[PDB]
């Protein structure tokens, strides 16, 4: 009798698909066919931050637009000064298998996590001179893929146990758990008002979660393979996903469907990271072919290329004030472009 | 670096740089190995001087003034394709197989095939242990090597059946630059840290001789 519920579910999916097709009256490309294309973009390496001894798996800018964290597999967590290339801190990690890092928006804390299934929070403004681990959030049954701060006291983490969770730091307990994915969640991104967030999992799907309740509002399926990266459009009414099938895509929360597709024939490797620009007219994307192609986020035409790395580009982040672009990679070097 | 505070901050930066360098040269003389194999195969008791120390379970036994770190990635229960590139730069891949189980044999064989022809481990050598040989040689007389491998044609005794299983495991190599060092631990009268030491010595010598052009 379960086939009755299955038929009702498939009827609901069919009605959803037909509603999506009914709301699709035009195309972003056909509309923006009239604007003028951005000329060739030539960003050049301004800084080179060296000092890691192994692959770099994550980085994150601070809100002040000058300092950034790097998490690496040699067990270190360095805090840089990107203007001067000084190292502000160097934090030794309890377990060298780290796959993510986050800088608090206030600048006081720094998170980290990886194969040990724990997200540990570090206190930078200690009364002593050292950086001490302030807490260890252990409630996940799979490696952590991403972690993002909301306050000094709320962090949201996504793990490869097919769940996302919202933590109360000073307490240590999962306030909410966002379940509903069927594959390993590989990335998350917070809305520019920190009330919603999207997650992209290995089941080739993205979802739109609500922080205060804990429900899933929308579900976007456009890819054929894993989703390794996700970003939110600056005004928070769209987001772009990158995947292992060499294809980025632009979804929009209001039309509840896909806007356009950024691919090419000479690109066969998967996207590792994506990020927008200060205004949303460019879309950067790190690839496994060691490059980083800048895209025209409204024409789907490749504008420039940041080819300066000798190994896969792991991480990628545009500065909060829009000035620079930092790209870490598996060859142990970060680079500040602009 | 003109201001007084800027000069002091640069001095702190240089101190951090030199501590990073010292930790790097100190952690470059460790030998990293990856323990694999199906569960219930002996991947937890190969080198009984093991000193263990859920995610990755490191283990740090030492032998002949050399530090061996062993990572057991079992019990992770995720998509291995997503976190296996963390161990893309280990020295070798230790693999344990329980010769006494005829049920876990094809699971172990497919897992060997998967980890042997991975794209990150296309030139990482394997140290295949065939654990629990004594029970195999005791029970082979009762349960022949035909309920597991129907293609068997040799004289059904211990030595030739074991050679056939070892050959069927090595038949999945399909790649140069990768040698599969076999051995048969018995778990009661064998001490096989010297086996890992010799295999790792040979692997590192081959890496070095392939860095000087020789192929």
């Amino acid at each position: 009798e379960l086939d009755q519920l299955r038929q009702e579910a498939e009827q609901l999916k069919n009605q959803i698909r037909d509603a999506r097709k009914a709301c699709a009256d035009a195309t972003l490309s056909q509309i923006t066919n009239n604007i003028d294309p951005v000329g060739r973009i030539q960003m050049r390496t301004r800084r080179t931050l060296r000092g890691h001894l192994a692959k770099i798996y994550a980085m994150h800018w601070g809100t002040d637009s000058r300092l950034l964290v790097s998490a690496s597999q040699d067990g270190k967590l360095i805090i840089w000064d990107s203007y001067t290339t000084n190292k502000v801190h160097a934090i030794p990690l309890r377990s060298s298998w780290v796959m993510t890092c986050a800088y608090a928006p206030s600048g006081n804390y720094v998170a980290c996590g990886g194969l040990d299934n724990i997200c540990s929070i570090y206190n930078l403004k200690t009364r002593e001179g050292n950086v001490r681990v302030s807490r260890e959030l252990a409630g996940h049954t799979g490696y952590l893929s991403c972690c993002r701060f909301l306050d000094d006291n709320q962090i949201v983490t996504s793990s490869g146990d097919t769940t996302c969770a919202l933590w109360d730091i000073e307490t240590g307990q999962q306030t909410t758990t966002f379940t509903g994915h069927t594959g390993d969640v590989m990335s998350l991104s917070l809305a520019p008002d920190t009330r919603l967030f999207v997650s992209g999992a290995c089941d080739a799907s993205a979802k739109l979660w609500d922080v205060r309740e804990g429900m899933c509002r929308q579900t976007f399926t456009g890819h054929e393979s894993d989703i390794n990266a996700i970003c939110f459009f600056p005004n928070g009414n769209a987001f772009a996903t990158g995947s292992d099938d060499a294809t980025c895509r632009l979804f929009d929360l209001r039309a509840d469907q896909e806007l356009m597709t950024y691919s090419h024939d000479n690109i066969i490797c998967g996207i590792t990271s994506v990020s927008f620009s200060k205004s949303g007219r460019l879309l950067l994307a790190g690839y496994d072919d060691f490059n980083c192609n800048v895209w025209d986020a409204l024409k789907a035409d490749r504008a420039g290329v940041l080819a300066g790395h000798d190994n896969r580009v792991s991480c990628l982040g545009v500065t909060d004030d829009g000035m620079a672009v930092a790209t870490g990679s598996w060859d142990s070097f970060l680079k500040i472009w602009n | 670096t003109l201001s007084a505070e800027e000069r002091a901050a640069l001095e702190r930066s240089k101190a951090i740089e030199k501590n990073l360098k010292e930790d790097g040269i100190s952690a470059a003389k460790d030998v990293k190995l990856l323990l694999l194999g199906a569960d219930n195969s002996g991947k937890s008791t190969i080198v009984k001087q093991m000193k263990i120390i859920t995610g990755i379970v490191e283990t740090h036994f030492t032998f002949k003034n050399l530090h061996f770190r062993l990572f057991d990635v079992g019990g992770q229960r995720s998509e291995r394709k997503k976190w296996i590139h963390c161990f893309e730069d280990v020295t070798a891949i230790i693999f344990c197989v329980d010769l006494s189980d005829y049920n876990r044999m094809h699971e172990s064989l497919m897992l060997f095939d998967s980890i042997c022809n991975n794209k990150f481990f296309i030139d990482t050598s394997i140290i295949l242990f065939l654990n629990k040989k004594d029970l195999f040689g005791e029970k082979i007389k009762k349960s022949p090597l035909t309920i597991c491998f129907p293609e068997y044609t040799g004289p059904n005794t211990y030595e030739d059946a074991a050679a056939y299983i070892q050959a069927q495991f090595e038949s999945k190599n399909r790649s140069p630059n990768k040698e599969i060092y076999c051995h048969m631990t018995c778990a009661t009268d064998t001490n096989n840290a010297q086996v890992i030491f010799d295999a790792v010595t040979d692997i590192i010598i081959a890496n070095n001789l392939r860095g000087c052009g020789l192929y």
Partner: single-chain antibody
Amino acid sequence: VQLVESGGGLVQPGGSRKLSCSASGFAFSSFGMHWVRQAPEKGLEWVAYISSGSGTIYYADTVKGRFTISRDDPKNTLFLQMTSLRSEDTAMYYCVRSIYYYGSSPFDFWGQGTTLTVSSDIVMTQATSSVPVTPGESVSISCRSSKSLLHSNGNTYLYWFLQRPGQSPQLLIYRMSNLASGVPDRFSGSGSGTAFTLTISRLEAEDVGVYYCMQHLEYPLTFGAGTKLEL
């Protein structure tokens, strides 16, 4: 965080004495360290500085060659060996910790003081000398420099200190606008290069003391004359 100094007492001129500060409760090996003396009824005065790792050392030009600063890190102790004392060294010596990175708060914790009796430079100018105040009115204090403290990188190196009667002086404001951790929001630092101000809005008790303005643009550091508050 704690710092206690030892080595006080009387000396005859020409003699020698070693002060020692024993630090406990922080990562002593990562802080720079100063010595700041204060004559019987005068203002503060910088004496010596030793880096973290003892890499770089500076001395005031009045104690150059006579004094020698050094630190022992495994024992968490800072030494000042004084040679050829004079009648002008009869002052109370403080020990100050200081850590330097982007965004730090140097001069944040001061020791307790060990009285010792013995039988060009930027010139800060605390124009006034005493201000009679009553609890409730907003009060401002004015400092002035001989050289533009605004460096080219954008920072203006001016620090404000408050010494309550019979206690160590504590940091209020660093780099002329940032409030120190643990200081009420009543205080506010303003001004431009060569002209600074500290406005104690919504005054209260516990704010009766002496306010010194220190520069940190280049060594040797020079404090100010010291403006006093009273009731």
